[PDB]
Amino acid sequence: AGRIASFLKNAWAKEPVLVASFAIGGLAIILPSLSPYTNYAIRINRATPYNYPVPLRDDGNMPDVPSHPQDPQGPSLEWLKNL
Amino acid sequence: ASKVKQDMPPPGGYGPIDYKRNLPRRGLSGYSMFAVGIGTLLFGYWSMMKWNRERRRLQIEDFEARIALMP
Numbered sequence: 460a461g462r463i464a465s466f467l468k469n470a471w472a473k474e475p476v477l478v479a480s481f482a483i484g485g486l487a488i489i490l491p492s493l494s495p496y497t498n499y500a501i502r503i504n505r506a507t508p509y510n511y512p513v514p515l516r517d518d519g520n521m522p523d524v525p526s527h528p529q530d531p532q533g534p535s536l537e538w539l540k541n542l
Numbered sequence: 543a544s545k546v547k548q549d550m551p552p553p554g555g556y557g558p559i560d561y562k563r564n565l566p567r568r569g570l571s572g573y574s575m576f577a578v579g580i581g582t583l584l585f586g587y588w589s590m591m592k593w594n595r596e597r598r599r600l601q602i603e604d605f606e607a608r609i610a611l612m613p
């Protein structure tokens with residue numbers, strides 16, 4: 460509570476480069492775990508269609524699978540265009 | 543009967559001559575410089591965030607064009 464303050468003052472007076480490096484590295488470690496945009500980044504990476512989407516053979520009881528790309532079923536990227 | 547003429551200082555004296563070191567401050571404070579730097583960094587981060595999200599959308603559109611043309 461009082462030792463750490465004096466140590467930080469001495470470090471800022473003597474080695475500001477090391478203090479800045481440790482602060483920036485600590486922020487780089489901590490901040491991603493507390494951000495709601497990390498999930499959005501994962502979703503954006505998952506939304507990129509690198510390969511062809513192979514169609515499924517219609518067996519007759521897949522309601523959620525679309526029959527046309529413009530059909531309402533399937534994943535939606537509406538959350539992305541508003542981001 | 544000519545009077546004496548010689549190289550002499552002017553009556554009274556010469557004007558004062560400065561010799562002390564003159565190094566002014568001529569600067570801001572550290573807090574101000576750090577604040578401007580961090581503000582510039584934040585503005586740049588915001589701009590690049592918007593631009594990269596738009597770039598992701600454009601790449602998705604290009605990939606969809608390729609997918610439509612693949613068969």
Ligand SMILES: CCCCCCCC/C=C\CCCCCCCC(=O)O[C@H](COC(=O)CCCCCCC/C=C/CCCCCCCC)COP(=O)(O)OCCN
Binds near residue numbers: 485
């Ligand atoms: C938590 C995340 C950490 C990981 C991320 C770090 C990223 C990269 C930074 C580390 C790189 C390696 C650094 C090497 C360590 C140096 C050790 C050392 O020997 O330093 C001494 C000096 O002693 C010191 O270590 C410097 C003081 C203590 C280290 C710096 C401060 C510690 C952390 C401060 C920041 C923490 C968060 C900021 C607080 C914000 C305020 C609330 C060198 O002095 P001399 O070479 O002998 O000088 C000869 C000429 N006179």
